[PDB]
Every structure is written in C-alpha cells, then in structure tokens.
Design an enzyme around this catalytic site. Sequence first.
Site, mmCIF file in Angstrom:
data_model
loop_
_atom_site.group_PDB
_atom_site.id
_atom_site.type_symbol
_atom_site.label_atom_id
_atom_site.label_comp_id
_atom_site.label_asym_id
_atom_site.label_seq_id
_atom_site.Cartn_x
_atom_site.Cartn_y
_atom_site.Cartn_z
ATOM 1 N N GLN A 1 4.118 1.823 2.843
ATOM 2 C CA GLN A 1 3.590 1.026 3.442
ATOM 3 C C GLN A 1 3.372 -0.704 3.064
ATOM 4 O O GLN A 1 3.462 -1.069 2.191
ATOM 5 C CB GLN A 1 1.929 1.106 4.439
ATOM 6 N N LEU B 1 -1.715 11.935 12.329
ATOM 7 C CA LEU B 1 -1.748 10.483 12.977
ATOM 8 C C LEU B 1 -1.307 10.619 14.560
ATOM 9 O O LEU B 1 -0.455 9.759 14.866
ATOM 10 C CB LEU B 1 -0.633 9.333 11.532
ATOM 11 N N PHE C 1 1.689 10.650 0.487
ATOM 12 C CA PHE C 1 2.095 10.816 1.930
ATOM 13 C C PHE C 1 2.724 9.091 2.667
ATOM 14 O O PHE C 1 2.974 9.852 3.370
ATOM 15 C CB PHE C 1 0.193 9.955 1.535
ATOM 16 N N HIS D 1 -0.320 7.111 15.650
ATOM 17 C CA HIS D 1 0.313 5.836 15.665
ATOM 18 C C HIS D 1 1.592 5.959 15.893
ATOM 19 O O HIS D 1 1.776 7.149 16.431
ATOM 20 C CB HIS D 1 0.000 5.994 13.837
ATOM 21 N N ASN E 1 -1.773 0.592 11.856
ATOM 22 C CA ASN E 1 -2.760 -0.059 12.626
ATOM 23 C C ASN E 1 -4.132 0.656 12.211
ATOM 24 O O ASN E 1 -4.286 0.809 11.275
ATOM 25 C CB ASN E 1 -2.452 0.498 14.398
ATOM 26 N N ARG F 1 1.119 -1.109 -0.102
ATOM 27 C CA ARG F 1 -0.272 -0.053 0.211
ATOM 28 C C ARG F 1 0.854 1.191 -0.051
ATOM 29 O O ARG F 1 1.246 1.540 1.025
ATOM 30 C CB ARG F 1 -1.404 0.338 1.006
ATOM 31 N N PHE G 1 5.403 1.688 8.037
ATOM 32 C CA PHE G 1 4.794 2.803 7.433
ATOM 33 C C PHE G 1 5.856 3.880 6.985
ATOM 34 O O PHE G 1 6.399 4.215 8.766
ATOM 35 C CB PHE G 1 3.341 3.634 6.858
HETATM 36 C C1 UPZ Z 1 -2.311 -2.710 10.465
HETATM 37 C C2 UPZ Z 1 -3.502 -2.191 9.901
HETATM 38 O O1 UPZ Z 1 -3.623 -1.900 8.044
HETATM 39 C C3 UPZ Z 1 -4.470 -1.499 8.016
HETATM 40 O O2 UPZ Z 1 -5.629 -1.166 8.611
HETATM 41 C C4 UPZ Z 1 -4.604 -1.118 6.708
HETATM 42 C C5 UPZ Z 1 -3.640 -2.180 5.622
HETATM 43 N N1 UPZ Z 1 -3.504 -2.457 4.002
HETATM 44 C C6 UPZ Z 1 -4.354 -1.455 3.284
HETATM 45 C C7 UPZ Z 1 -4.519 -1.432 2.447
HETATM 46 C C8 UPZ Z 1 -5.514 -0.066 2.039
HETATM 47 O O3 UPZ Z 1 -6.138 0.618 0.743
HETATM 48 N N2 UPZ Z 1 -5.670 0.484 3.283
HETATM 49 N N3 UPZ Z 1 -4.891 -0.789 4.585
HETATM 50 C C9 UPZ Z 1 -5.613 -0.866 5.563
HETATM 51 C C10 UPZ Z 1 -6.233 0.519 6.280
#
Ligand code: UPZ
Length: 164
Positions: A62, A121, A59, A125, A101, A54, A112
């Site tokens: 991740q 954040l 931004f 976070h 999270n 992601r 990230f």
């Molecule tokens: C550890 C918590 O990870 C998340 O909340 C998370 C992880 N991956 C993605 C891809 C996306 O588009 N949204 N997304 C989120 C909100």
Amino acid sequence: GNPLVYLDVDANGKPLGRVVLELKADVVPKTAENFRALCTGEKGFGYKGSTFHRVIPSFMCQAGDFTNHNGTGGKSIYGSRFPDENFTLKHVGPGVLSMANAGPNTNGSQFFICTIKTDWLDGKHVVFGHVIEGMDVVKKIESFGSKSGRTSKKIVITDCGQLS
Ligand SMILES: CCOC(=O)c1cnc2cc(=O)[nH]n2c1C
C-alpha cells in the site's frame, strides 16, 4: 486507450526498478483519471516522492499517502474523497491495483497492489487496474513488509508519470 502509468521505486535509496500499471479507464474512468493525474503531478501534487508505508507479505503493498506519509492522509484530484465508482473489477490475483479506503466512498489517493487473490475485498475496494510490467519490483517491495504492515526498508516512489 487505457492509460499506462509508471512508478519508479527505491528501497533505502537504491532503485528497484519500474512498476507499469494499466488503468482501466474503460471500466472506472473517474478512478483511473485520479490515479493518472496523481502520477503525472499535473494538478500540483501527487505520488512523486511518497512512500509505500504499509506492506504485508502474502497480501498487498500500500502507498499513496503523499500528505502524511503514514496512512492517515492523501487526497484526490477532485477533493479530499470521492465515491466508490463501481465494484465491477475483482481482486482476482497478484498484480491487481485497487483503492485503499476507510469505508464506503472514502477514496482519496491511497492504493494497493495485491500480491495474492484477495477475494474478500470484492465489493469493498474499487479495483482500477493491474501490473503490466514490474511484478519483480512488487515482490521486492513485498519482501520488505511485515505482518503489522511496517516496512523494514524505506520504500519511495522517486518518479512517476504517464507512458500513454
Ligand atoms: C485510505 C485508508 O487507509 C487506511 O485505512 C489505512 C492506511 N494505512 C494503514 C497502515 C495500517 O497499518 N493500517 N492502515 C490503514 C487501515
């Protein structure tokens, strides 16, 4: 001193280089230790071979879902999740390393790297380090993201570990 760890990153099977991160174990020892051990793999699992799944330009980038490779998974060295240690370090600008999270006290393995100041954040976070070297690699990764977070190249942490 604080750990230094590295991520070697490919895009579509070709190396981009190395991101070196300082882990602020002086501020967030439990969070730093988790990331450190996931980099070395010394508990039998960790980031080696997993992806940046992601990535949102202007931004953050991740990664860290080494179980499901899509954002739903990951686990910490302590268990599936662990508490927010503190919120003392802030999302001050590009290069900040922070825990992803899904609400309070849901830290696992996903993390990230910010490419901008992400002040909203703060308090949500746990920041636990920053980029020492390799922001160029981070900018390459970022350039392969999209507004939706879907990546346009396959971004893989091929190797990772601890430098000191
Ligand atoms: C550890 C918590 O990870 C998340 O909340 C998370 C992880 N991956 C993605 C891809 C996306 O588009 N949204 N997304 C989120 C909100």
